[PDB]
Amino acid sequence: KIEEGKLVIWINGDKGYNGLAEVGKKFEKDTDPKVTVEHPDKLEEKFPQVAATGDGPDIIFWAHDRFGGYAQSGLLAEITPDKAFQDKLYPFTWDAVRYNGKLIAYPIAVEALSLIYNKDLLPNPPKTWEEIPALDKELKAKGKSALMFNLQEPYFTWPLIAADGGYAFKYENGKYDIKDVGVDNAGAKAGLTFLVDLIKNKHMNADTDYSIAEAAFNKGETAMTINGPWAWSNIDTSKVNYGVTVLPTFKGQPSKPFVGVLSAGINAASPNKELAKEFLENYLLTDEGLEAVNKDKPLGAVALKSYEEELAKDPRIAATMENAQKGEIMPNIPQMSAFWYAVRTAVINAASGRQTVDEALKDAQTRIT
């Protein structure tokens, strides 16, 4: 069972866990309870397993898309901010954490992928996906590459798959139809085919993952990467002269990243629900609390209006929101888990040559519906 009188918090390893720990120290200093912050691997899978036995963290941080499934499984406590508190955060962030007519988490920040590029290697970054092969040939001649990004997580390839028409669940008239999925449509196939062609033509390697792409960009070996706000700290440290901008278009249409709202849920089994609420409302979701996390690894466009006013002046955040507006907020429905697993396999299989694009997406579509 969860220990009474302290808070255990889980957040992903790419986020500001050390900054969050600093907020936890302040909470302890002012109100008493120790706060322990951990970042277990595969925590979005780990959480439902341990929470099911009445264990795990008091507070779980993840993008909002995983939360409907958690709520459906009975793993989340009710969250009931009063009106005054609700007014401090943007409406669309609350909507991302609204499930079956109730709020199931506190929204923290809006995340969207952007194109990150090295201004020294590439002062004028490409506006289109289609110009990347020629750009890579030019760079390969100089012992550099045009682009490296994580190919193991479909989050990163989805913007291209969606560009020409792929979609997860059709949303019509305020409702998601779980039987209308757009994973093996022509648009999805076209986008995935373009990616696989980049691999076939040696412009990218199928085994490139988060670590490899981060290192390559930060070491100045590749002119571009695709990543989120959390990644900007390590780039700063590397001293690479970078920019953050609009993702390239595909077939003249914008890349459409799936927008995540980093959110904090309270474990239904926590005996510390009131401590968790106080921590989230009165320590974390304050200008000082978000600054502490943000200075560690950037959060993106925060949900808290007062601090977002400060962050909005950052051109990287502006680029983040431009890409967010061209994309779509993720559904939070329980079927998102199945969606992501199926698309993950489809992209890896197509990228590695285990299956054709058409067969990979056909199988994913089938698995999802």
Indicate which CATH number applies to the domain containing 165: 3.40.190.10
Residue written as tokens 């401590």? 275
Q: Answer yes or no: do 264 and 323 share one domain.
A: yes
Structure tokens at 180: 């209308």
Q: Answer yes or no: do 216 and 87 share one domain.
A: no
Measure the CA angle with vertex 279, ends 97 and 291; round to 5°: 85
Strand duo 102-103 + 301-302: pairing: unpaired
Query: Cβ distance 201 to 133 under 8 Å?
Result: yes
Residues 229, 303: Cα–Cα separation, whole Å: 14
Structure tokens at 235: 């780039």
Number of domains making up the chain = 2
Helices 154-163 and 336-352: crossing angle, nearest 10°? 90
Q: Answer yes or no: do 177 and 241 share one domain.
A: yes
Resolution in A for the shown PDB structure? 1.9
Q: What is the 3-state secondary structure (H, E, C) of the chain?
A: CCCCCCEEEECCCCCCHHHHHHHHHHHHHHHCCCEEEECCCCHHHHHHHHHCCCCCCCEEEEEHHHHHHHHHCCCECCCCCCHHHHCCECHHHHHHCEECCEECCEEEEEECCEEEEECCCCCCCCCEHHHHHHHHHHHHCCCCEEECCCCCCHHHHHHHHHHCCCEEEEECCCCEEEEEEECCCHHHHHHHHHHHHHHHCCCCCCCCCHHHHHHHHHCCCEEEEEECHHHHHHHHHHCCCEEEECCCEECCECCCCEEEEEEEEEECCCCCHHHHHHHHHHHHCCHHHHHHHHHHCCCCEECEHHHHHHHCCCHHHHHHHHHHHHCEECCCCCCHHHHHHHHHHHHHHHHHCCCCHHHHHHHHHHHHC
Q: Answer yes or no: do 210 and 155 share one domain.
A: yes
User: CB within 8 A of 17, min separation 6: which ones?
Assistant: 11, 37, 38, 39, 296
Residues 166, 160: Cα–Cα separation, whole Å: 9
Q: Answer yes or no: do 171 and 217 share one domain.
A: yes
Query: Cβ distance 135 to 129 under 8 Å?
Result: no
Q: Count the neighbouring beta carbons within 10 Å of the beta carbon of residue 134.
A: 12
Structure tokens at 366: 């089938």
Structure tokens at 75: 């793993």
Q: Answer yes or no: do 251 and 357 share one domain.
A: yes
Burial of 100 (C-beta count, 10 Å sphere; 0-12/13-18/19+) = exposed
Q: Give the domain extent around 67.
A: 5-111+260-331
Rg from Cα positions in the chain: 20
Q: Give Cα 120 to chain centroid, integer Å.
A: 28
Q: Which of these, 4, 53, 5, 24, lies nearest to 264 by C-alpha position?
A: 24
- The torsion angles phi and psi of 89, rounded to 5 degrees, stand at -120, 155
Q: Answer yes or no: do 284 and 207 share one domain.
A: no
Residue type, 313: K
Q: Which of these, 216, 208, 212, 214, lies nearest to 228 by C-alpha position?
A: 214
Q: Answer yes or no: do 207 and 307 share one domain.
A: no
Q: Answer yes or no: do 207 and 142 share one domain.
A: yes
Give me the residues paired with residue 167 across strands.
Answer: 182
Q: Answer yes or no: do 122 and 150 share one domain.
A: yes
Query: Cβ distance 261 to 93 under 8 Å?
Result: yes
Q: Answer yes or no: do 248 and 356 share one domain.
A: yes
Query: Cβ distance 162 to 154 under 8 Å?
Result: no
Residues 230, 227: Cα–Cα separation, whole Å: 8
Q: Answer yes or no: do 127 and 219 share one domain.
A: yes
